[PDB]
């Protein structure tokens, strides 16, 4: 799409404030979550908590400006989180569908990764997320029944999981 | 007061989250003025924009939690910008006097540099911050009256002067 690109995360104060922009509209404005920046502090040390530990953290851009990310962390050889997944809502489906080319960059990575397992937590009230997930072919699961060396927030959200 | 400290910033991802927190608790929540952390991105370059240009930036610790802030921003040998001035409001006034302990370390700092003058905005709506500044000596002034290689925010704010 125009003057929009999808890379890696790197360190540059303009795109990492512009990052916590989105993340705090997306979960605190738009679905008022009440989310602190405190509870997400890799944030703020996404090299060393993403990239330098076999996961990724990409970033869109439109006009140098960041308009949506997204994040993998691996857990193990088989199985990372999807996590940190934002757009701001006019880059949602037609025409520039940001979420499913965030989510296909992802993807290039994981399965280049040999990971066989892809898993992730969304809100329980976030409808469009839950459709948005399972055309991208995720399918629910239960907490109590996933296996996985992760703690999923404490909060009222759903599990959702996609093997490769 | 008791498990609390006040100390220069160092680069601290923990401590960077908890910052972003208040400052977007004081701006945003409490005084709904909608300021964008895009707005101030010196708050993800602290050391670069403060701390190696004769400025300074400090944080209010209350058992290793970012409760406050303050900082100082040279303008030239004469003068200094007060900025990114923040604290949580249990913290305010009796017993704690948090924003009265940063402004006297913003001061001893402010003089030791030999700034004679020190200047700041605040919002028009904000009547509890303009009484606190007037009692630490904190004058009013017109922005098309003062002199200063410094542009203020394009808001509805005035400026306060303290000539030491
Ligand atoms: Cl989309
Ligand atoms: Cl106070």
Redesign the pocket.
Known sequence: FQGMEIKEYENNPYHLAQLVDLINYCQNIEAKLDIKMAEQDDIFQIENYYQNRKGQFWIALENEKVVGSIALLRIDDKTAVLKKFF?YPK???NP????????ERFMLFARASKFTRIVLDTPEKEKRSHF?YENQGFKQITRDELDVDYIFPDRDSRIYVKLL
């Open positions: 757009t880059y949602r489906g520039v569908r940001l979420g499913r080319k965030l989510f948005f």
